Amino acid sequence: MSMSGEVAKEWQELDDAEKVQREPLLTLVKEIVPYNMAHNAEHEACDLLMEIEQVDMLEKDIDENAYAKVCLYLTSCVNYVPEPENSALLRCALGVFRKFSRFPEALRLALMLNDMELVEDIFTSCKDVVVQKQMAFMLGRHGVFLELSEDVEEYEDLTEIMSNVQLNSNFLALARELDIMEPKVPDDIYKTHLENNRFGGSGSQVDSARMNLASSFVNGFVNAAFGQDKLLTDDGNKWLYKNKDHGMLSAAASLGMILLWDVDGGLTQIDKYLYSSEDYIKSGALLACGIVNSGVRNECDPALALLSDYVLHNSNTMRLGSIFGLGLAYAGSNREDVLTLLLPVMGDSKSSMEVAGVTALACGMIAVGSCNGDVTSTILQTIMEKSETELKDTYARWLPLGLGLNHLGKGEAIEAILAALEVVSEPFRSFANTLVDVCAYAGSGNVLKVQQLLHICSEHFDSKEKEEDKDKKEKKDKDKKEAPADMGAHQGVAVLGIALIAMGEEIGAEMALRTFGHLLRYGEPTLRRAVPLALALISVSNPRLNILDTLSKFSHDADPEVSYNSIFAMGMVGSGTNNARLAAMLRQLAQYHAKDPNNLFMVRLAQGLTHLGKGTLTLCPYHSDRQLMSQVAVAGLLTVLVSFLDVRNIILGKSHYVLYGLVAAMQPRMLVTFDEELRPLPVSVRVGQAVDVV
Amino acid sequence: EEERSKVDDLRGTPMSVGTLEEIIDDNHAIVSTSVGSEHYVSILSFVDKDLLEPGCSVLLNHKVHAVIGVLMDDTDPLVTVMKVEKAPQETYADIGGLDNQIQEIKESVELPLTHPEYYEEMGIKPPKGVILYGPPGTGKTLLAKAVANQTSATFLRVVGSELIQKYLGDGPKLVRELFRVAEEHAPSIVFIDEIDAIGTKRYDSNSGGEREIQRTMLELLNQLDGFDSRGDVKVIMATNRIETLDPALIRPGRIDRKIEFPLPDEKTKKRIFQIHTSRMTLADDVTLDDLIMAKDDLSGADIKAICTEAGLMALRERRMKVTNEDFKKSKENVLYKKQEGTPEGLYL
């Protein structure tokens, strides 16, 4: 019209086409082009506000985007009746995509505020009420795909439109960096459960059909996988050759080949150190000496015979680390020893864990992928023989570690048979017992299990176990973000919050320093004692900066309880890498005059922070650690704990044969460490030797 | 909570703000308040006496001349100048064309901080910073790494200039400028630029002249020499031409790396302008083949100036247009500007 080409700048040329609409339709863009093309003219981009409506109703595309570059506003609300809107929008949907990638094969757009913002602004009304399946599927743009989805449960989002491997490589890569901040990640194939045949088959189809370059993610996948669950479900999903792929499965030759490679990257001293300690006969500690020979040998039977014959003396809990080496020796590859491993169980009423519960733990933990399936039914049948003598307390801690480890989705339920013994009613012993007892049975994930076990146990309620009971629901759902919503209670016992922040948040970036720092300053006294315990999870990213900083003030504190949780906070997550600050800090720590095991628990556990399963041949020399443990053992003089510490640094020191690292790069979590490490907090007598299994 | 309503009667409500003089081992702390008054103050409260140090703003209670505690000190007009950050608004996407120079010193500025393992095993270490020089922007050439060092740790820019900064000299309060900014973070980068000492028109006010400008530079050495400083405070010096530093001054630093950037070539100038215009061009359409071919030669300084006036003269048309008779006439002004001093020489 003539008003659009006026020299005056007076408003407005917007929305004026709604008043008189059908009449201006008689004209065409031929009147509009001389005003916008000629320079030194008024209403250049202002005339596009009326033109964006004419090009939209005429289905012309790439013109509406070019005219909306300056506008950026009227594109949202534009003329209401939805039928003309959703009609031309699908014409605009399919019509803009054909204007892109016409070369063909990119060049890509060219998130830009023109193309990506216009499809995002219109996507509002798209995700509001009508239609479905906007240009994000048609154009295949991964940039708009991040803005395509809306807040929803991601469990059903694991499926996508199938395409070529070329585009799927970039699709899964850019969808991964979107899901690293999201609770669910592509790595969830481990955790989930699921358990359907979909992920097992699709996991083996990414390397299909090439069996040569498949060496990665297949050959290195089966050998580094300790559990049979990944080697069972994927066995039916692996079609290569026929029936003979089991040689690289079951962890028979798998664990044997990587163990020989650990010897090539090893090794650990055998004759020198052990036979020299044999002239010292048996130390008065009866604590860390058994687990030594466990990981070391592996496989040799002569060292296994000294274990057995000795521990028939039955003295105290010393049998723990020993019989744990009975199975682990032959089980280093496969199967193994699972026949005579469970024989001492019924051969030794327990009446406690330190007597017959040792060998009963052996078959459970040393299993590592069994099931198979005889070991499952064997462990359940073996524990049903001993009930009143176990009873509900001491051996009920380790028994769930023989099932939930291998299979989180196992159909066999061992909880109901054990839960009938809770009639002992003891609130004290049940603390460290029922904590990991109900939690380590299975990973669950159906939300129905935690509701069941809450009604049958409580009944009522235990007034104590209900603390640790709700933490299982926090452990059940992994980093689902429901945990920050579950901490609003914040009971005076405070055990809820500390276990909630650690396990309830798993992500690459911490982001928890705002909440973790708030609970310690706003929390009641004595809570700061258990605050560092959350450092075993969220600190796996950059433990160097944040950990030793705050723990430096907590290490010199005179309170023995907080100093016991300080060195533990660093602990394993802080022992991954060495440094000169860690070695220089070791000075003056062992020079303290303080008594009690907290003194040597601070210094000696930090001696294992110099490396994990590395050396000594190749690489770090053992003479440096030998002179350190010898000079510190000359004090007191015994103080038998000086014989505990010098054998403590060689627990993980001389074991080797396992590189962890992390464990693990696949992002699982060790269920034996988080279990046992919570007992040393109210440490009394034998709760420290249960942790010595590691 | 209760300590707020308890000690308030023990100190206040009224009190005074004095200064600290000296401390005696008998717990009597001599303080001095305006004007010319001393006293013996023995207080066990809230101290913290070790962190104080004299010259402090420490309070003095009215009854009777006792120090209950401290609040804070701002202090002086001197701190309000810089106000951090500086944040990386000078971007590596504003520079380009230099390769052999950009590789070497990138290590020295990144040699501290990351990769500490082989840095501490050395134990000698080069914690001297670096040194820059050269016209017009040869010192500004690697300044882009100093702003690239603003993405982590901390940066400081101190204008050396010539006259306005005088003082005793004694350099008393400029060491304060370096010290107060390092107290916030304590990594540091300290940058000095444009030393005019050789190009002075005259001495400023009562300083010297001649040797007293030299002795405050010799004090600039003794500060920087220096006894005794361990950490950083990473020292970076820059100027147009350095005849200044004595053979003694270069030995502490910078004895490792000092830089020289040669005049740009056709590859650098094209990479200078195209990268400078990567954010913003003029009327798009810009081709760099005829730009470096027409004017031969001169630094990439003025190539932005002729483009500054390019869209500026076209702004008489309020956005976009080019007049062939006017553009080459407006280009004649800068073309002759460099064509007045064309020969040297034969600089060769």
Side-chain angles (χ1 to χ4, degrees):
Chain A
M1 63 185 75
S2 63
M3 182 179 69
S4 298
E6 185 180 2
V7 184
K9 57 180 177 296
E10 184 70 18
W11 290 92
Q12 71 284 358
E13 298 176 351
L14 53 90
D15 79 42
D16 57 349
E18 180 67 17
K19 296 179 180 297
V20 190
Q21 184 175 356
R22 180 179 296 178
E23 181 180 0
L25 294 177
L26 278 68
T27 59
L28 291 175
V29 197
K30 60 180 183 298
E31 297 298 326
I32 305 302
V33 281
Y35 303 147
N36 297 336
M37 186 62 68
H39 194 62
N40 294 283
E42 189 62 28
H43 302 292
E44 296 177 351
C46 181
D47 194 18
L48 303 181
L49 279 70
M50 182 182 70
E51 183 68 19
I52 189 174
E53 172 65 20
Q54 295 180 339
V55 301
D56 189 17
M57 65 176 292
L58 266 61
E59 294 178 351
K60 293 189 297 182
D61 289 333
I62 221 175
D63 295 338
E64 184 274 337
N65 180 30
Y67 299 153
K69 299 173 60 180
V70 184
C71 298
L72 296 176
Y73 182 83
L74 278 71
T75 306
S76 179
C77 298
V78 63
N79 51 27
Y80 57 87
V81 47
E83 181 67 19
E85 294 301 314
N86 55 32
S87 295
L89 187 38
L90 270 60
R91 305 297 179 274
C92 183
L94 293 169
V96 171
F97 161 71
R98 59 181 177 88
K99 302 301 291 183
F100 295 158
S101 299
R102 188 58 69 92
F103 192 81
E105 295 301 324
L107 70 316
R108 200 173 186 174
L109 302 179
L111 277 66
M112 191 171 182
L113 60 90
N114 290 334
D115 286 336
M116 294 294 100
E117 185 180 2
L118 194 148
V119 299
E120 178 183 3
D121 187 16
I122 192 61
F123 188 77
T124 299
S125 298
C126 298
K127 65 187 182 67
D128 282 339
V129 44
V130 295
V131 296
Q132 196 61 52
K133 188 178 64 61
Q134 293 303 322
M135 293 180 60
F137 300 94
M138 305 163 185
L139 178 62
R141 175 57 48 82
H142 303 81
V144 74
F145 178 79
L146 271 62
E147 298 172 346
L148 163 66
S149 297
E150 302 82 358
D151 295 339
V152 73
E153 56 279 4
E154 208 271 338
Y155 184 84
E156 61 182 344
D157 289 335
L158 303 180
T159 179
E160 70 278 0
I161 175 173
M162 294 180 180
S163 62
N164 53 338
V165 183
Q166 184 63 256
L167 293 178
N168 189 28
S169 61
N170 288 334
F171 181 85
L172 183 62
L174 274 69
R176 179 175 294 101
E177 59 184 344
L178 170 61
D179 297 342
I180 55 175
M181 303 301 298
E182 192 171 6
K184 297 183 69 65
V185 298
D187 296 342
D188 64 339
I189 57 100
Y190 176 78
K191 301 293 190 297
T192 59
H193 307 82
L194 267 56
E195 286 299 319
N196 49 29
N197 199 32
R198 287 294 180 186
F199 78 95
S202 63
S204 180
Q205 286 180 337
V206 65
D207 294 3
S208 178
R210 184 67 172 175
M211 296 294 101
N212 291 279
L213 300 177
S215 179
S216 297
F217 188 75
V218 175
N219 194 340
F221 183 84
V222 297
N223 56 33
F226 63 95
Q228 189 69 249
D229 192 15
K230 282 185 167 185
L231 277 66
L232 176 63
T233 58
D234 291 341
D235 188 16
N237 300 132
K238 185 181 295 180
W239 294 282
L240 61 87
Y241 305 135
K242 187 62 175 175
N243 202 2
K244 73 184 191 69
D245 52 10
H246 193 66
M248 66 181 292
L249 301 177
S250 67
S254 297
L255 294 178
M257 289 298 103
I258 62 174
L259 182 59
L260 294 177
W261 184 89
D262 295 338
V263 178
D264 187 20
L267 43 78
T268 180
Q269 184 60 55
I270 165 67
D271 295 340
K272 186 175 182 294
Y273 173 78
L274 292 181
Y275 286 88
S276 63
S277 178
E278 187 175 0
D279 295 340
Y280 188 72
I281 197 61
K282 184 57 183 64
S283 179
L286 296 165
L287 167 48
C289 293
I291 185 59
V292 175
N293 193 27
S294 298
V296 175
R297 299 299 180 189
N298 281 277
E299 299 83 353
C300 70
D301 29 331
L304 179 143
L306 190 148
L307 293 179
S308 65
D309 191 15
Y310 171 77
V311 301
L312 261 59
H313 187 274
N314 211 349
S315 176
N316 291 277
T317 159
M318 170 59 191
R319 306 177 62 183
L320 186 56
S322 174
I323 303 177
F324 184 80
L326 171 64
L328 180 60
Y330 303 144
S333 62
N334 250 268
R335 309 294 286 178
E336 194 65 17
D337 196 21
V338 296
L339 45 105
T340 43
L341 198 47
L342 191 135
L343 190 146
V345 182
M346 61 186 75
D348 188 15
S349 179
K350 284 181 172 295
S351 297
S352 58
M353 170 68 184
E354 54 273 7
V355 184
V358 171
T359 172
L361 165 60
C363 183
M365 180 172 175
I366 310 169
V368 189
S370 63
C371 87
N372 262 275
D374 190 18
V375 177
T376 289
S377 298
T378 303
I379 291 174
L380 272 65
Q381 182 177 355
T382 308
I383 188 59
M384 287 301 297
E385 183 273 339
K386 45 185 182 303
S387 181
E388 186 273 339
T389 60
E390 172 187 0
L391 23 91
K392 186 55 179 173
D393 296 338
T394 182
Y395 177 71
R397 297 177 176 177
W398 288 100
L399 182 64
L401 280 70
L403 182 63
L405 267 65
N406 185 22
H407 300 293
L408 285 72
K410 182 62 176 176
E412 294 297 326
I414 201 170
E415 183 277 340
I417 54 177
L418 269 64
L421 297 176
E422 196 178 2
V423 301
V424 294
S425 298
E426 300 298 322
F428 294 97
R429 183 62 59 182
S430 66
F431 179 80
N433 178 32
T434 59
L435 172 61
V436 304
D437 188 15
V438 71
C439 291
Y441 288 134
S444 178
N446 207 349
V447 186
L448 301 179
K449 179 182 295 297
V450 65
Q451 185 174 354
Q452 294 178 341
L453 309 184
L454 175 63
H455 189 277
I456 180 173
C457 175
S458 65
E459 288 177 351
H460 295 287
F461 56 89
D462 189 71
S463 68
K464 186 175 183 180
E465 190 274 338
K466 62 180 184 64
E467 187 82 3
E468 300 168 344
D469 192 15
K470 189 179 69 62
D471 297 340
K472 186 184 66 62
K473 178 182 61 60
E474 183 271 342
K475 182 202 67 60
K476 183 184 64 63
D477 292 339
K478 299 182 179 68
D479 65 43
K480 292 299 292 182
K481 302 304 179 183
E482 186 180 0
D486 292 339
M487 67 175 291
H490 187 277
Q491 297 301 323
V493 189
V495 185
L496 299 176
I498 176 58
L500 184 143
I501 179 62
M503 179 67 178
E505 294 299 323
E506 181 175 0
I507 33 179
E510 295 81 0
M511 190 179 288
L513 299 179
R514 50 177 182 181
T515 302
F516 178 80
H518 178 57
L519 51 84
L520 57 87
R521 64 173 70 97
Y522 179 77
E524 77 282 2
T526 217
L527 172 59
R528 187 173 294 181
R529 176 183 62 189
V531 167
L533 308 178
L535 272 55
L537 291 178
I538 58 176
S539 304
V540 297
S541 61
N542 294 279
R544 184 57 53 84
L545 297 175
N546 298 335
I547 301 311
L548 53 83
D549 185 17
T550 60
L551 294 181
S552 180
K553 297 173 295 298
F554 296 157
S555 62
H556 300 78
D557 189 12
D559 183 77
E561 288 82 1
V562 301
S563 179
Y564 198 94
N565 311 141
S566 62
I567 185 59
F568 160 67
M570 192 172 295
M572 180 181 68
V573 65
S575 61
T577 57
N578 199 345
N579 192 27
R581 176 58 184 170
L582 278 68
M585 184 181 66
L586 303 178
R587 184 183 295 177
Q588 195 172 356
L589 291 183
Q591 297 178 340
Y592 294 146
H593 58 281
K595 61 179 64 179
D596 294 341
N598 64 331
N599 184 26
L600 48 290
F601 184 84
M602 167 70 179
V603 183
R604 186 52 58 181
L605 191 141
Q607 301 303 121
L609 270 58
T610 180
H611 63 76
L612 298 174
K614 295 180 63 61
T616 60
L617 202 149
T618 314
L619 187 142
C620 53
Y622 185 76
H623 299 288
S624 62
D625 287 338
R626 179 181 296 272
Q627 296 178 337
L628 192 148
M629 71 179 80
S630 297
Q631 295 176 338
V632 70
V634 200
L637 175 41
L638 275 75
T639 84
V640 191
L641 294 177
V642 303
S643 180
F644 155 68
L645 56 87
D646 55 18
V647 72
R648 169 57 61 182
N649 63 339
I650 64 105
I651 300 306
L652 54 86
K654 298 304 290 183
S655 59
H656 303 279
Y657 291 142
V658 173
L659 55 99
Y660 58 105
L662 270 64
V663 137
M666 191 178 61
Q667 292 295 106
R669 292 185 179 177
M670 290 295 295
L671 302 178
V672 301
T673 55
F674 302 151
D675 169 17
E676 294 308 319
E677 285 297 331
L678 296 180
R679 294 176 179 81
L681 311 177
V683 54
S684 181
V685 275
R686 63 181 182 90
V687 297
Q689 187 148 346
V691 188
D692 186 69
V693 176
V694 177
Chain B
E1 38 183 338
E2 297 179 351
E3 57 183 343
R4 182 63 174 172
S5 63
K6 183 178 69 65
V7 302
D8 56 349
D9 309 344
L10 280 57
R11 48 172 175 86
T13 155
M15 58 188 78
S16 176
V17 182
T19 58
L20 179 58
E21 176 174 352
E22 58 183 338
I23 301 174
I24 309 171
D25 59 344
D26 292 340
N27 296 338
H28 300 287
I30 298 175
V31 295
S32 298
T33 187
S34 177
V35 54
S37 64
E38 295 80 2
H39 190 258
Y40 295 143
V41 184
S42 295
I43 47 99
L44 204 135
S45 293
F46 189 77
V47 285
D48 201 17
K49 57 182 180 179
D50 184 75
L51 182 143
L52 299 184
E53 184 176 2
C56 270
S57 190
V58 300
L59 316 180
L60 267 69
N61 297 337
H62 274 307
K63 298 295 177 292
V64 194
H65 291 290
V67 44
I68 183 65
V70 301
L71 270 58
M72 252 292 98
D73 207 15
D74 189 17
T75 182
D76 303 339
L78 181 60
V79 186
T80 317
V81 276
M82 53 190 79
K83 299 297 290 183
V84 84
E85 176 56 33
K86 186 182 176 60
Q89 300 215 2
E90 291 82 355
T91 61
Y92 71 98
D94 285 339
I95 73 162
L98 44 103
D99 52 345
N100 201 341
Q101 187 186 10
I102 208 176
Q103 52 179 18
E104 190 276 344
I105 193 172
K106 187 59 174 175
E107 175 72 27
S108 184
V109 297
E110 294 297 325
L111 179 60
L113 285 72
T114 61
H115 190 193
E117 45 273 3
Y118 283 149
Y119 178 82
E120 60 184 346
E121 293 300 323
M122 187 82 75
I124 298 300
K125 71 187 173 296
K128 312 309 292 183
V130 295
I131 278 185
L132 322 178
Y133 58 84
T138 297
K140 190 192 300 180
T141 291
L142 299 178
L143 182 147
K145 282 175 175 174
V147 59
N149 290 328
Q150 301 176 2
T151 64
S152 302
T154 309
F155 169 81
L156 171 59
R157 183 169 70 88
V158 175
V159 179
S161 175
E162 183 258 328
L163 59 97
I164 269 302
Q165 44 279 56
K166 175 190 70 59
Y167 28 90
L168 268 57
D170 175 50
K173 291 186 63 62
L174 263 65
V175 185
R176 300 180 182 271
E177 298 177 350
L178 305 179
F179 187 80
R180 62 180 173 87
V181 63
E183 185 178 8
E184 310 306 321
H185 307 86
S188 292
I189 282 95
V190 171
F191 174 74
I192 299 171
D193 186 46
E194 294 305 319
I195 297 171
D196 295 344
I198 189 170
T200 60
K201 299 299 183 294
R202 194 182 61 88
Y203 60 109
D204 177 285
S205 64
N206 60 336
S207 290
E210 217 299 320
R211 49 181 172 81
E212 180 176 353
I213 307 171
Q214 183 178 357
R215 77 171 63 193
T216 185
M217 179 175 63
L218 180 59
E219 165 60 16
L220 179 61
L221 164 80
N222 202 18
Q223 174 193 2
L224 192 148
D225 198 14
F227 194 79
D228 51 340
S229 181
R230 180 180 65 86
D232 51 342
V233 64
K234 293 291 283 182
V235 170
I236 303 172
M237 298 178 68
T239 183
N240 293 335
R241 177 188 301 274
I242 165 187
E243 293 185 351
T244 63
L245 297 186
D246 190 76
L249 321 196
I250 308 176
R251 308 307 303 277
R254 199 63 177 100
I255 199 60
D256 185 73
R257 180 49 177 165
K258 65 192 301 182
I259 64 100
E260 184 276 340
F261 162 74
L263 56 90
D265 53 10
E266 62 177 348
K267 298 179 300 300
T268 300
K269 297 175 182 179
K270 182 180 179 181
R271 197 68 170 173
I272 275 176
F273 180 81
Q274 177 54 54
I275 284 183
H276 280 91
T277 54
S278 294
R279 283 179 170 270
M280 299 173 291
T281 61
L282 58 95
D284 192 74
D285 77 38
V286 171
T287 58
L288 280 74
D289 190 15
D290 59 347
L291 293 176
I292 62 175
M293 180 177 176
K295 48 179 179 297
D296 172 83
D297 257 339
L298 189 135
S299 67
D302 299 340
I303 193 177
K304 184 174 294 292
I306 60 174
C307 292
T308 299
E309 65 186 350
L312 169 67
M313 182 61 183
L315 189 52
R316 304 298 294 270
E317 296 135 339
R318 308 295 189 274
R319 203 176 190 272
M320 297 281 107
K321 186 55 180 172
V322 175
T323 308
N324 293 328
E325 59 184 346
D326 181 71
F327 178 77
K328 291 183 294 297
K329 182 185 63 61
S330 60
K331 185 61 168 59
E332 177 272 336
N333 191 28
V334 186
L335 178 61
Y336 164 73
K337 185 61 166 58
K338 65 175 64 181
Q339 281 183 340
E340 172 66 15
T342 319
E344 192 72 12
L346 296 190
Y347 194 68
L348 218 39

